[PDB]
Amino acid sequence: ARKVILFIAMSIDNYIADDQGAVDWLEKNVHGTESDDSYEKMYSKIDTVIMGRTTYEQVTQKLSPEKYVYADRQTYIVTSHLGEDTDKIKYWKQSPVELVKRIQKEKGKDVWIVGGAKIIDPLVQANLIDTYILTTVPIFLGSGIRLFDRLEEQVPVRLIDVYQKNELVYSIYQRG
Amino acid sequence: ARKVILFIAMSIDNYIADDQGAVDWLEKNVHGTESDDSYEKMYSKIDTVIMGRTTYEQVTQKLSPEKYVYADRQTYIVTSHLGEDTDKIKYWKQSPVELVKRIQKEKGKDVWIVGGAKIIDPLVQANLIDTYILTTVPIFLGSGIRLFDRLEEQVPVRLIDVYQKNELVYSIYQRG
């Protein structure tokens, strides 16, 4: 099966960025220099990334230093904006839930839901995430963009594992 | 020094109770029967509990089956209600921050901040919590009473430890 994965960092108070969409205060609050392999491990298992228009713009600008960081995967951009599709990038004007259900009926590997909250929240509400890798950073941010603001459904999950690297808590949950 | 401790359970989405103030869906989502000693350990170190009027009423009714569960400690009830003080219970009409600063200048042991969010949030904003024992339950609640809703200050903390019992994540942070 094509597993749907959420791998994201957030503050103790469940903010993923500040007011501006900046992540620098989350990055500032890592304590230590030890390696973690969650990202490389997850990334090796996916063939597809799904994200909204703002996250796409942020990643292409701020994260990609020499070319688009996820050029080596299939990208869906879930947006009402009418962009130009390519062999590697597809603009999706329907709901994220409809995208994920269609993908799951297709041949392939795993799928990473990158962000933002408008993409992620409906997929959790729909119980369509298979694996949650949630990284808590040792900071109360006090304001900003909150993830899981108000899902309006109970979604029970199961704890697979938990550990700490550089004072970050890595919590790994699975769909019940 | 008199350390100020927060020991509370919440969902992945940072809810501490439902809409009604009920905690039964958090309790329902524990998976396993192994013992944990965090509560007894913390409780042994305190001489004082501080809580708001609703939490006091809930604990005296729902948690105390044969007499007030925290009768063996000094209780502060932070409320504008004019209750009747006793040798073991004191009604505090000023801010929770003023209470904690005064207590800290006095002789004694540690202090537990029980709840609710109106008591806890200002104390975190003020950086007055020394130890955080935060227990995440494997559930998105989707609505209810949220803790750390909007502290409006950055509060960096340090991860002391993290572990799992019965699929609950116990994260222990210390004041920076």
What is the structure about, briefly put?
Two copies of one chain form a homodimer. Chain A has 176 residues and is an alpha/beta fold.
Supply the key terms.
Dihydrofolate Reductase, subunit A, RibDG_C (chains A, B), two-stranded antiparallel ribbon, homodimer, 176 residues, 5-amino-6-(5-phosphoribosylamino)uracil reductase activity (chains A, B)
Topology:
The structure is a homodimer of 176-residue chains.
Chain A (H helix, E strand, L loop, with lengths): L3 E8 L3 E3 L6 H4 L10 H8 E7 H11 L10 E5 L10 E4 L3 H9 L5 E6 L1 H9 L5 E7 L1 E2 L4 E2 L8 E11 L2 E8 L1
Parallel strand pairs in A: 1-6, 1-7, 3-4, 3-6, 4-5
Antiparallel strand pairs in A: 2-9, 7-11, 10-11
Structural class of chain A: alpha/beta
Determine the most extensive contact between two protein chains: A-B, 37 and 37 residues
Question: Fraction of residues of chain A in helices?
Answer: 10-25%
Straight-line distance between termini of chain A: 16 Å
Principal-axis shape of chain A: globular
Identify the CATH homologous superfamily of chain A. Answer: Dihydrofolate Reductase, subunit A
Please state the second-level CATH architecture of chain A.
Answer: 3-Layer(aba) Sandwich
Q: What order do the SSEs of chain A take from the amino end to the carboxyl end, as H and E?
A: EEHHEHEEHEHEEEEE
Total helices of chain A: the number is 5
CATH topology (fold) name of chain A: Dihydrofolate Reductase, subunit A
Beta-strand fraction estimate of chain A: 35-45%
Number of strands of chain A: 11
Number of domains of chain A: 1
Describe the sheet with the most strands of chain A. 8 strands, mixed
Q: What is the CATH domain class of chain A?
A: Alpha Beta
Cα-atom Rg of chain A, whole angstroms?
Answer: 16 Å
What topology, given as strand order, has the largest sheet of chain A? Answer: 5-4-3-6-1-7-11-10
Please identify the oligomeric state: homodimer
Organism (chains A, B): Pediococcus pentosaceus (strain ATCC 25745 / CCUG 21536 / LMG 10740 / 183-1w)
Protein name (chains A, B): Dihydrofolate reductase
Domain Bacterial bifunctional deaminase-reductase C-terminal (chains A, B): 2-161
GO biological process, one term (chains A, B): riboflavin biosynthetic process
